[PDB]
Amino acid sequence: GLKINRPRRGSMGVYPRKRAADIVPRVRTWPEVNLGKPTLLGFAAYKAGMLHAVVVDDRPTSPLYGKEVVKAVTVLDAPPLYVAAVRLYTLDPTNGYKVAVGEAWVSEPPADLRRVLTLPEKFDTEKQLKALEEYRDVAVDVRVLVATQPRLSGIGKKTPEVLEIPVGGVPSIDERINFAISLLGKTVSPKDVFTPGQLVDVIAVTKGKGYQGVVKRFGVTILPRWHKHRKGHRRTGTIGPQAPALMFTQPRPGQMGFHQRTEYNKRILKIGDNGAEITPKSGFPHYGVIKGPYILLQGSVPGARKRLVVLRYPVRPPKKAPPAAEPQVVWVSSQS
RNA sequence: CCGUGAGGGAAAGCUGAAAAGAACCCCGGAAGGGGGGUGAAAAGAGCCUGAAACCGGGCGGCUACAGUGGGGCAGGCCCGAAAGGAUGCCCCCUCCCGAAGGAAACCCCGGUGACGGGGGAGUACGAGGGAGGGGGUCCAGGGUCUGCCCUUACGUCUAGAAA
RNA sequence: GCAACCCGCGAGGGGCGGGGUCUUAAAGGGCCCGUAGUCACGGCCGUGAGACCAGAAACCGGGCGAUCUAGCCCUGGGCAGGGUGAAGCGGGGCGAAAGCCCCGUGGAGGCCCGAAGGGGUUCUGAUGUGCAAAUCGUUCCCAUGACCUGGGGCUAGGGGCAAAAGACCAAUCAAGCCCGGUGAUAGCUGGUUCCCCCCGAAGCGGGUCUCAGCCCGGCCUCCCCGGAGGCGGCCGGCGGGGUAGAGUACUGAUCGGGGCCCCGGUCAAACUCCGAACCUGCCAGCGCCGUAGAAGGGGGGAGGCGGGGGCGGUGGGGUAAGCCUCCGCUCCGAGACGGGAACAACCGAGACCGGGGUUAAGGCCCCCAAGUGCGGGCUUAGUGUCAAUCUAAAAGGGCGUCCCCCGCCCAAGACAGCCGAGGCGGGGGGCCCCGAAGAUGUACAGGGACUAAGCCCGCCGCCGAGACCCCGGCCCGCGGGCCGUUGGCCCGCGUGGGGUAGGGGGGCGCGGCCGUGGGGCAGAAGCCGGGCCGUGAGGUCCGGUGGACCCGCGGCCGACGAAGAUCCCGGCGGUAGUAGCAGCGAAGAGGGGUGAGAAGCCCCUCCGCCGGAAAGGACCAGGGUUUCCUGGCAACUUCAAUAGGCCAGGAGUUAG
RNA sequence: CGCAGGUCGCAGUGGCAAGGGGGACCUGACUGUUUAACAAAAACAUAGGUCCCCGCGAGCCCGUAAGGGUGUGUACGGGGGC
RNA sequence: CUUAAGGUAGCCAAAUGCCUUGCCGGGUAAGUUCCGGCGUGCAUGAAUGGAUCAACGAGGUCCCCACUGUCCCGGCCCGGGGCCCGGCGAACCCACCUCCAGGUGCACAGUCCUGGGACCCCCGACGGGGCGAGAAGUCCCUAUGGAGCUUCACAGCAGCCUG
RNA sequence: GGGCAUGACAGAAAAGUUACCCUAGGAAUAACCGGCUCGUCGCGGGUGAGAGUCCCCAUCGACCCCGCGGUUUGGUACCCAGACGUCGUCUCUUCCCAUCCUGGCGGUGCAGCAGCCGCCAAGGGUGGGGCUGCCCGCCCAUUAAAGGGGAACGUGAGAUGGGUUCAGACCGUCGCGAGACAGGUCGGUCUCUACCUGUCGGGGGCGCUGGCCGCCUGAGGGGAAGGUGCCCUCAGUACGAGAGGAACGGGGCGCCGCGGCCUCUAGUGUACCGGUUGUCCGGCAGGGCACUGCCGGGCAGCCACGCCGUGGGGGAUAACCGCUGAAAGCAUCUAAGCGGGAAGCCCUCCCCGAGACGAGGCGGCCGUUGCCCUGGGGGCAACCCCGGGGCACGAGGGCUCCCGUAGAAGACGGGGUUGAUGGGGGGGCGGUGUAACCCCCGAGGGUUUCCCGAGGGGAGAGCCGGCCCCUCCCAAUCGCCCGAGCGUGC
Ligand SMILES: [Mg+2]
Ligand SMILES: [Mg+2]
Ligand SMILES: [Mg+2]
Ligand SMILES: [Mg+2]
Ligand SMILES: [Mg+2]
Ligand SMILES: [Mg+2]
Ligand SMILES: [Mg+2]
Ligand SMILES: [Mg+2]
Ligand SMILES: [Mg+2]
Ligand SMILES: [Mg+2]
Ligand SMILES: [Mg+2]
Ligand SMILES: [Mg+2]
Ligand SMILES: [Mg+2]
Ligand SMILES: [Mg+2]
Ligand SMILES: [Mg+2]
Ligand SMILES: [Mg+2]
Ligand SMILES: [Mg+2]
Ligand SMILES: [Mg+2]
Ligand SMILES: [Mg+2]
Ligand SMILES: [Mg+2]
Ligand SMILES: [Mg+2]
Ligand SMILES: [Mg+2]
Ligand SMILES: [Mg+2]
Ligand SMILES: [Mg+2]
Ligand SMILES: [Mg+2]
Ligand SMILES: [Mg+2]
Ligand SMILES: [Mg+2]
Ligand SMILES: [Mg+2]
Ligand SMILES: [Mg+2]
Ligand SMILES: [Mg+2]
Ligand SMILES: [Mg+2]
Ligand SMILES: [Mg+2]
Ligand SMILES: [Mg+2]
Ligand SMILES: [Mg+2]
Ligand SMILES: [Mg+2]
Ligand SMILES: [Mg+2]
Ligand SMILES: [Mg+2]
Ligand SMILES: [Mg+2]
Ligand SMILES: [Mg+2]
Ligand SMILES: [Mg+2]
Ligand SMILES: [Mg+2]
Ligand SMILES: [Mg+2]
Ligand SMILES: [Mg+2]
Ligand SMILES: [Mg+2]
Ligand SMILES: [Mg+2]
Ligand SMILES: [Mg+2]
Ligand SMILES: [Mg+2]
Ligand SMILES: [Mg+2]
Ligand SMILES: [Mg+2]
Ligand SMILES: [Mg+2]
Ligand SMILES: [Mg+2]
Ligand SMILES: [Mg+2]
Ligand SMILES: [Mg+2]
Ligand SMILES: [Mg+2]
Ligand SMILES: [Mg+2]
Ligand SMILES: [Mg+2]
Ligand SMILES: [Mg+2]
Ligand SMILES: [Mg+2]
Ligand SMILES: [Mg+2]
Ligand SMILES: [Mg+2]
Ligand SMILES: [Mg+2]
Ligand SMILES: [Mg+2]
Ligand SMILES: [Mg+2]
Ligand SMILES: [Mg+2]
Ligand SMILES: [Mg+2]
Ligand SMILES: [Mg+2]
Ligand SMILES: [Mg+2]
Ligand SMILES: [Mg+2]
Ligand SMILES: [Mg+2]
Ligand SMILES: [Mg+2]
Ligand SMILES: [Mg+2]
Ligand SMILES: [Mg+2]
Ligand SMILES: [Mg+2]
Ligand SMILES: [Mg+2]
Ligand SMILES: [Mg+2]
Ligand SMILES: [Mg+2]
Ligand SMILES: [Mg+2]
Ligand SMILES: [Mg+2]
Ligand SMILES: [Mg+2]
Ligand SMILES: [Mg+2]
Ligand SMILES: [Mg+2]
Ligand SMILES: [Mg+2]
Ligand SMILES: [Mg+2]
Ligand SMILES: [Mg+2]
Ligand SMILES: [Mg+2]
Ligand SMILES: [Mg+2]
Ligand SMILES: [Mg+2]
Ligand SMILES: [Mg+2]
Ligand SMILES: [Mg+2]
Ligand SMILES: [Mg+2]
Ligand SMILES: [Mg+2]
Ligand SMILES: [Mg+2]
Ligand SMILES: [Mg+2]
Ligand SMILES: [Mg+2]
Ligand SMILES: [Mg+2]
Ligand SMILES: [Mg+2]
């Protein structure tokens, strides 16, 4: 094998490293959470920028407990989501696949939805709800179809993004259906979904970097004593043994970035109502200003500075939950 | 024409009987193109005939869920004027003869049984060879494609070649 | 003589005898004798000649070369700047003398640093279908001298020249180049061109400066002579033999017992009292072949003189080998086809063409034609899945499980801890388990999968080749017959029909000639496509194109047939609208004019590069009109063009 | 060429231009020469040392020969080795 | 004693020591190299030159200081290639042209067997495979093949000496 | 007729050397790799003399014997001489298990701490240096441990080129000699524009049973996405005569790997600002060139030396440990049944994903139509059917346009007047460092103290932004296209 042991260069768990099929993250997994009341299990927001904050450490066993520590934070611009439709799911008896059985739309969808959808002038919502009720007894899951409101964000674009977010919180399917139907035509604000201090998972398409070489793409070494090597140094030496031929595990140049990634256990530090208190006087570089609600996340988030980011309840939460009390954010670097 | 030199050294034939060598009109910057002329024939000065490779266009067949070339059988689409048959070919029916070979239903005897034996029966049938009747329209041949079956480029030394 | 066959004569053939001659004292022996040659035409082969075609490195003859390079000679040119500081010469200081010390002056050196110039170290940099058949960048070495450089001159091939590397002597040097000897030779390598039909090998023995060659035999083929016997099989009569086994008796080896002997035991390629199977000699018979020609003999031509697989000789050797070296049958080579998953030589089996039928090996759950066929038993490990090539397994352990045999106990007081019926041990067999570990991809050995669709003992039917049977067609060998015949046709018979090298027999095509008969401007040859005929080489016809020659038949002759030779010459592709048109320290822009057309030609403005020069001034050799003017753009310039060292037309070089 | 004073920068040989230095061993004394096109060297040469053939009509070498080189020279010389 | 003598002065695990990374010191955290010693030295030694390094070195080597993108360990930037457009417009190579696995076979298959896959076409990149391309293998052997060189080979010819 | 001789004996008269080498050929024949073989090499098993205080088998294993692997070396000569690039290293990927650590279990001559031995197990780890051309090996400091093998001795059309193994040269030795040595030593060209395939990423189309939009599903595919240490407590406790000295559980944090991100810090930053050298533009100011002239600072962007995330569980199992339990009145983990049991396998988790041809589900939008020109046929009286073309209707889509969450080309995303998409203008925030003008100070000198003078101070900064906001002032225009519609059968 190798002359000297060392781990392989880069992961093959993200193979193939192709461009994401869609700029909007498509979430595969939604957790089962018992909150005691029905609620959406996720939210969507626009990444605005990064700052750093002075946060009091509230972990009693932590060596920094009670101290003020500086943490890098990510600001999300989070205008309310507009609920456009409710969809019901059952299980196909032939194979156990989850299958949509129907959906009910708001009668008068907003004009901006017409930029992406082929809609009638009016939906007859009552008939659709009536038809939906026939499938109540075979329902296993209920999701709402939400549209973003980018006009209320700092981006200012008009074309919205549309995605499904399930309703959870209680084990009873019927109450989830009743709660989802009550949301038809209404908006959902981040405070309706999350509470400050809780953990969330974040899913987004990462920043694009175009075609990149094998050194940057996989972390292969530049050939040591770089000047010695004819035909270049930013490369692998060989591209394989004699057999098997080029395998799919061989590092090769290609697209780097613009992939969908999921990161876990990011703490929500603050959910604000008015973004003027967090927007720097210069504005967020390459983004703009935040005028409505915002989410302050501890740490970094995948994606470029205008990407739509999906937050969900965690699917791998740690054994010990964070403290119930809201974290104490003393100061943020965008302030005086 | 090549080598300082001694020396070395190619390729390259054909308008038409006659120039009758293309007047004249339109277009083009021009080479030239279209129309219109000459001649038995463009044979048009890049000049007899004008093959193949090769490239363009048209036509026939195929073409994005199916692994390629060759052969046989069956079929689809297309061609099938002449030089081949059309007294053809194809289908049906009936009749006769028929090599090697050759059942079945059913009755009887045996075996646990797979099956064997006597009769039915050297029958029904059977390559092919003869005769007639009804119906149809091309048949042969060719291009290409599909299905099924078969199939390991050539030349060579070698004990041994798809190597 | 019915025939069978017997008898006589008996050319040719065979044997003797006789004769000529040589040798010898002679006998004996050698050669020769009772008839056929010679000349020609065609063919095959040998030897020479270039000798089927292509191919060396070489060697010799006579010439040509020192514009390159090596050396030397004659006559010209060049080397910024700086540093060090020899001999010699002054002054001062110390000092008793000698002398010593300091400072200066001076300007030596195959001295030092470093431009020009010369050289060529490193990056083992760039380039590596290059700018270039040796270059470029960078870093380097020398740079007043054994220094660098121009012109002229000398030394020439077995010779030169060499501060010597066998360097260099015109991109050529462990012996130049040109032409000639010369088509050098090659046991070696490559190539060697139409069809059908008949037969059909070999890699063995001997000799060889022989081992990649060749010759004489074996094996093939064709022809002729000859004339009745022959032998890959079997039975018998009469013989030969010394292997397997056996023995341990001769020659040897070797373990024990008993008193050099006796008894028991272990052995032998180079031991043998015995002794098979088996092979082999003669005779008789059988069987088959043979007068449609046995034995034997003569002549022509070979190929080949590298073999290989299976099985058998424990062959002999070797740890073993898809190993080396012998002996024998068969098969591949030179043999199609069915089965084996594939697969020259394992099994089956030998193929002219078409069709029908039946079997062989092997198979019958699906792939896949035919059985989810029949009875019994075993295995629980997916063990395994119908011989070999072919992908596997040992010593050993296991009552795991199925089974067989033996010994002992129990006569119901056995085994196990009164109860009541079987119990304990040994030996063996079947299947399976452990022993059992590998490298790209699944219980691999064809795949699916199967608890039988596995294994063992038996059984029934079916499928399945080109084999075997039958029908039709074709061809062949041999024999017979007919026909005025360098040939044609008919009949009969064949347990006739594969074939490389090679031998033998017949036909097709191409160019010409000698004859004969014809076609063609109402359309020859050629060319494109098509129909028909022939097993085939090929022939013939039709439609189109073309524009003047051509063909049938008989005979004769060749500069006579291509798919291939890193073949030759020409043309033309894919590659591909791809590489390159970057790198070496300059580059363009605006406006106007000309013009069919302008980023690029002409004019101005702006911007840049050289300036002890890849760039300004002069000029030798070499080049030879490239100079200048006018006009132009088919070609030429790595793009464009109205430009040009290009093209056309004209002109131009003045000397005491 | 020198002296005194003032003064700025991160940097005053400001760009350009322009030695890294020291210790030791092997080896050839040195400068020089070399495999044009894979070897620049410790190889060749070298000054110096030493030996040999030679008194010139010599020694050594070239030429078929006529003749020639060393030699317009002469042992403090010519030639030949190491 | 053996073909005469019998390695002297020196020098050394040497560019010369196989054994051998010899043994002991130095230097390193760690030293098969290097330096200093040691020496019956496989096989050192005197113009075949021995010992010997001042000066010199594009010679070969070890150590120290300084220094740094050599490295830890990679990042960003600049000019030209690159990529795209316009224009010009080749070559190498080429029997035909090839998805993967495990087999089989002249023993290392694109083409054979049994499997596993694949909608087709196009662009960029690379260099694992095509036993990739280049060059009738220089290695090695064979040939009753060469060339040049050597001498105690077989011969021969000059040159010199001698009658 | 006898003899004189060829012993290489079916009869030439015959020495070397080539690494300066050349030609013809040979896989008839060596060297590398491959094939066969496995003596050798490595690994496993049987046996049990003997050692182990007693005690064969905790640990060993004499004398012998049975095997496996293809990993050393050899044997052979089957393929390849019109050629498969010859050692090592670098880089990069994968596979094996006969397991060094990490997970599980057992034995011990296992008190504890350690150690030794066996079994399951290949998911992950197995590192940094010194010496030598190495490979191997020895050594140093660490470490959980610093395993071994295969892939044409993996990988030179990827590199490197130190050794080996060309031509030059030196030494020792051998040879009369030229020369030779697989003994040492110094020097000594690493060629190719990628045709096919593969791999990695990026596009166009056709299909999915009329066209389209949006949201989903999940067959299968990929994954190591995580691995592994340390400290405290337990506790100076258990154990132990002492010396010494654990563990489960609980708490905290790294190292290596993977995936993101740019707030901080660091790098860069030929946008930008300033200083300054030489020269040129007459001087000042401003500027060219010195290939950013050099130097300092530096926004955005990119980036690591920076920051963030990176888990437990469930199921069936392996080695095995047990329950009940007969065969076999007892006993027995096993024969039926049952319980427990690994970093391994599967799922959970992350990525790709309907070309998943059984081409899927859901909701919605659209089409399911007409007219014109022309050719043919039927009966001709309209008419109807068929061929070709054109136009209209029509959801949706594209080009053109302004751009950037994107980007080699394509693609993707945003905007397009019902509009803040780029620019301009104003404002915010930021870089540099304080322009011009004016006033004061200035070492000293002179037309004497109204001039020169490097420079210092004040007020004012000045220049600039590939960032944010606001504002229609300019430009997102004019336009060019694609598009289902119909039959037939099962
Ligand atoms: Mg290099
Ligand atoms: Mg013509
Ligand atoms: Mg016809
Ligand atoms: Mg007719
Ligand atoms: Mg051969
Ligand atoms: Mg062979
Ligand atoms: Mg062949
Ligand atoms: Mg001859
Ligand atoms: Mg000769
Ligand atoms: Mg001569
Ligand atoms: Mg000259
Ligand atoms: Mg000098
Ligand atoms: Mg070099
Ligand atoms: Mg180079
Ligand atoms: Mg190149
Ligand atoms: Mg100098
Ligand atoms: Mg030499
Ligand atoms: Mg010569
Ligand atoms: Mg010669
Ligand atoms: Mg010649
Ligand atoms: Mg025959
Ligand atoms: Mg041969
Ligand atoms: Mg007999
Ligand atoms: Mg015997
Ligand atoms: Mg015996
Ligand atoms: Mg015998
Ligand atoms: Mg032989
Ligand atoms: Mg044999
Ligand atoms: Mg042969
Ligand atoms: Mg077969
Ligand atoms: Mg069947
Ligand atoms: Mg055995
Ligand atoms: Mg098995
Ligand atoms: Mg025959
Ligand atoms: Mg004739
Ligand atoms: Mg041929
Ligand atoms: Mg040609
Ligand atoms: Mg071409
Ligand atoms: Mg290019
Ligand atoms: Mg310059
Ligand atoms: Mg230019
Ligand atoms: Mg200048
Ligand atoms: Mg100058
Ligand atoms: Mg000049
Ligand atoms: Mg001129
Ligand atoms: Mg002119
Ligand atoms: Mg001219
Ligand atoms: Mg400089
Ligand atoms: Mg020297
Ligand atoms: Mg050279
Ligand atoms: Mg050199
Ligand atoms: Mg010397
Ligand atoms: Mg001396
Ligand atoms: Mg001497
Ligand atoms: Mg001594
Ligand atoms: Mg010395
Ligand atoms: Mg010594
Ligand atoms: Mg040394
Ligand atoms: Mg000596
Ligand atoms: Mg010496
Ligand atoms: Mg000596
Ligand atoms: Mg000396
Ligand atoms: Mg020198
Ligand atoms: Mg182009
Ligand atoms: Mg095989
Ligand atoms: Mg191939
Ligand atoms: Mg490409
Ligand atoms: Mg050859
Ligand atoms: Mg050769
Ligand atoms: Mg010979
Ligand atoms: Mg002999
Ligand atoms: Mg190889
Ligand atoms: Mg070998
Ligand atoms: Mg062994
Ligand atoms: Mg034991
Ligand atoms: Mg081996
Ligand atoms: Mg061989
Ligand atoms: Mg081979
Ligand atoms: Mg080859
Ligand atoms: Mg290769
Ligand atoms: Mg090659
Ligand atoms: Mg194991
Ligand atoms: Mg290798
Ligand atoms: Mg290479
Ligand atoms: Mg390679
Ligand atoms: Mg080297
Ligand atoms: Mg070397
Ligand atoms: Mg060498
Ligand atoms: Mg000697
Ligand atoms: Mg390349
Ligand atoms: Mg998976
Ligand atoms: Mg990272
Ligand atoms: Mg900077
Ligand atoms: Mg100024
Ligand atoms: Mg200037
Ligand atoms: Mg500049």
Short mmCIF file of N, CA, C and O (backbone and C1' of nucleotides) in Angstrom, two decimals, chain B residues 9-27:
data_model
loop_
_atom_site.label_atom_id
_atom_site.label_comp_id
_atom_site.label_asym_id
_atom_site.label_seq_id
_atom_site.Cartn_x
_atom_site.Cartn_y
_atom_site.Cartn_z
P G B 9 21.94 10.52 -60.68
"O5'" G B 9 21.04 11.82 -60.76
"C5'" G B 9 20.08 12.11 -59.76
"C4'" G B 9 19.23 13.29 -60.16
"C3'" G B 9 18.58 13.18 -61.53
"O3'" G B 9 17.43 12.37 -61.53
"C1'" G B 9 19.58 15.30 -61.32
P A B 10 16.95 11.66 -62.87
"O5'" A B 10 16.15 12.81 -63.63
"C5'" A B 10 14.74 12.77 -63.72
"C4'" A B 10 14.07 13.30 -62.47
"C3'" A B 10 12.59 13.61 -62.63
"O3'" A B 10 11.78 12.47 -62.44
"C1'" A B 10 13.69 15.45 -61.64
P A B 11 10.80 11.97 -63.59
"O5'" A B 11 9.50 12.86 -63.40
"C5'" A B 11 8.87 12.99 -62.13
"C4'" A B 11 8.12 14.29 -62.03
"C3'" A B 11 7.15 14.59 -63.16
"O3'" A B 11 5.89 13.98 -62.96
"C1'" A B 11 8.50 16.48 -62.78
P A B 12 5.13 13.28 -64.18
"O5'" A B 12 4.93 14.45 -65.24
"C5'" A B 12 4.10 15.57 -64.97
"C4'" A B 12 4.30 16.66 -65.99
"C3'" A B 12 4.17 16.25 -67.45
"O3'" A B 12 2.82 16.15 -67.88
"C1'" A B 12 6.11 17.55 -67.18
P G B 13 2.41 15.02 -68.94
"O5'" G B 13 3.04 15.52 -70.30
"C5'" G B 13 2.52 16.65 -70.98
"C4'" G B 13 2.41 16.37 -72.45
"C3'" G B 13 1.00 16.35 -72.99
"O3'" G B 13 0.53 17.64 -73.29
"C1'" G B 13 2.21 14.48 -73.80
P C B 14 -1.02 17.99 -73.12
"O5'" C B 14 -1.71 17.16 -74.28
"C5'" C B 14 -1.47 17.48 -75.65
"C4'" C B 14 -2.56 16.92 -76.53
"C3'" C B 14 -3.98 17.28 -76.09
"O3'" C B 14 -4.80 17.49 -77.23
"C1'" C B 14 -3.71 14.92 -76.09
P U B 15 -4.91 18.96 -77.88
"O5'" U B 15 -6.45 19.30 -77.81
"C5'" U B 15 -7.21 19.07 -76.64
"C4'" U B 15 -8.58 19.68 -76.76
"C3'" U B 15 -9.32 19.35 -78.05
"O3'" U B 15 -9.97 18.10 -77.97
"C1'" U B 15 -9.49 21.66 -77.59
P G B 16 -9.86 17.06 -79.18
"O5'" G B 16 -10.67 17.74 -80.36
"C5'" G B 16 -12.07 17.90 -80.28
"C4'" G B 16 -12.58 18.96 -81.22
"C3'" G B 16 -12.25 18.78 -82.69
"O3'" G B 16 -13.06 17.81 -83.33
"C1'" G B 16 -11.93 21.04 -82.05
P A B 17 -12.42 16.72 -84.31
"O5'" A B 17 -12.09 17.54 -85.63
"C5'" A B 17 -11.30 16.99 -86.68
"C4'" A B 17 -11.41 17.85 -87.91
"C3'" A B 17 -11.17 19.33 -87.67
"O3'" A B 17 -9.81 19.67 -87.80
"C1'" A B 17 -13.20 19.02 -88.85
P A B 18 -9.15 20.81 -86.89
"O5'" A B 18 -9.77 22.16 -87.43
"C5'" A B 18 -9.58 22.58 -88.77
"C4'" A B 18 -10.53 23.70 -89.12
"C3'" A B 18 -10.49 24.88 -88.18
"O3'" A B 18 -9.53 25.83 -88.61
"C1'" A B 18 -12.73 24.18 -88.51
P A B 19 -8.61 26.62 -87.57
"O5'" A B 19 -9.65 27.48 -86.74
"C5'" A B 19 -9.35 28.80 -86.33
"C4'" A B 19 -10.55 29.47 -85.73
"C3'" A B 19 -10.25 30.70 -84.87
"O3'" A B 19 -11.38 31.57 -84.87
"C1'" A B 19 -11.33 29.11 -83.57
P A B 20 -11.82 32.42 -86.15
"O5'" A B 20 -13.37 32.11 -86.28
"C5'" A B 20 -13.82 30.78 -86.52
"C4'" A B 20 -15.26 30.58 -86.12
"C3'" A B 20 -15.55 30.64 -84.63
"O3'" A B 20 -15.79 31.95 -84.15
"C1'" A B 20 -16.43 28.65 -85.51
P G B 21 -15.80 32.23 -82.57
"O5'" G B 21 -14.74 31.19 -82.03
"C5'" G B 21 -13.44 31.59 -81.67
"C4'" G B 21 -13.27 31.45 -80.19
"C3'" G B 21 -12.52 32.59 -79.49
"O3'" G B 21 -13.16 32.86 -78.25
"C1'" G B 21 -11.54 30.54 -78.95
P A B 22 -13.28 34.36 -77.69
"O5'" A B 22 -14.82 34.54 -77.38
"C5'" A B 22 -15.80 34.50 -78.41
"C4'" A B 22 -17.10 33.97 -77.89
"C3'" A B 22 -17.55 34.56 -76.56
"O3'" A B 22 -18.27 35.76 -76.73
"C1'" A B 22 -17.69 32.19 -76.49
P A B 23 -18.12 36.97 -75.69
"O5'" A B 23 -18.47 38.26 -76.56
"C5'" A B 23 -17.73 38.56 -77.73
"C4'" A B 23 -18.63 39.04 -78.85
"C3'" A B 23 -19.66 40.09 -78.47
"O3'" A B 23 -19.13 41.40 -78.46
"C1'" A B 23 -20.69 38.38 -79.75
P C B 24 -19.37 42.39 -77.22
"O5'" C B 24 -20.95 42.41 -77.05
"C5'" C B 24 -21.79 43.15 -77.93
"C4'" C B 24 -23.25 42.86 -77.67
"C3'" C B 24 -23.71 43.08 -76.24
"O3'" C B 24 -24.04 44.43 -75.97
"C1'" C B 24 -24.43 40.96 -76.97
P C B 25 -23.82 45.05 -74.50
"O5'" C B 25 -25.04 44.48 -73.66
"C5'" C B 25 -26.36 44.91 -73.91
"C4'" C B 25 -27.35 44.22 -73.00
"C3'" C B 25 -27.05 44.31 -71.52
"O3'" C B 25 -27.48 45.52 -70.94
"C1'" C B 25 -27.54 42.08 -72.08
P C B 26 -26.64 46.19 -69.74
"O5'" C B 26 -27.02 45.30 -68.47
"C5'" C B 26 -28.34 45.24 -67.98
"C4'" C B 26 -28.46 44.26 -66.84
"C3'" C B 26 -27.42 44.40 -65.74
"O3'" C B 26 -27.71 45.44 -64.82
"C1'" C B 26 -27.60 42.13 -66.35
P C B 27 -26.51 46.22 -64.09
"O5'" C B 27 -25.94 45.17 -63.04
"C5'" C B 27 -26.75 44.69 -61.99
"C4'" C B 27 -26.11 43.55 -61.26
"C3'" C B 27 -24.75 43.80 -60.64
"O3'" C B 27 -24.82 44.55 -59.44
"C1'" C B 27 -24.73 41.72 -61.73
#
